Amino acid sequence: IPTTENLYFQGHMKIKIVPAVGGGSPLELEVAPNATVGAVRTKVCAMKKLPPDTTRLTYKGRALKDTETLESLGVADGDKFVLITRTVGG
Amino acid sequence: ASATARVRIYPLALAKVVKHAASSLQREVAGLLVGKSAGKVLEIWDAVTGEQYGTPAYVQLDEMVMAKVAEELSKSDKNLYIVGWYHSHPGLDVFLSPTDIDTQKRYQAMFSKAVALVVDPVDYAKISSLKFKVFQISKEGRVVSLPVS
Ligand SMILES: [Zn+2]
16 A cells, blocks of 8 residues: 555545536546635646636635635535636726 | 637627627626537637626626536536627727736636627627627737637
């Protein structure tokens, strides 16, 4: 058993992240209740080759702050988030 | 030059954009473009909108509009998705402002073939047509107006 194998299985909660724009694959991330929304969004942005400062995660009907824990939101295995970006004109 | 070679807009989708814009000459309006890519062709199948705040010089679509629309499209059996956004520029002519460019750069980061449709309801092109363009930021970072049909 590789020393880092333990790290692979930390947190058996699976969450689905839908990118709001484009038809690209949703991500199915394995996370812990103690994870922050920011930690999730960081992994999502890494996977999608996005910069870190341009998107937000949404859950139910609200945008999430990166500092909130998944635990504090009542997130459960299987829940779904959407990754949005701002739509602002001038 | 650019990720999208040309844009095909379903006539009713265009009509929905124009009517939305024409119904609020006193402020900018915005919404979302729904469709799919087909190779380098971007197909716009529908245009949808929702809660927003705007003035004659600015508009922001509530972010939960995008969230709702994306989740619905993802859940459905249709292979359609958000492909871009639109906004109006009443009496201000058709271009991407610095604000718009920033929004569009962010759309393209998530979906390389994304486009921004800008309509000015108070004007008509020239045979007449609707006063609009579909823009994309090119690979070298310039705003380009794409061929539309
Ligand atoms: Zn604009």
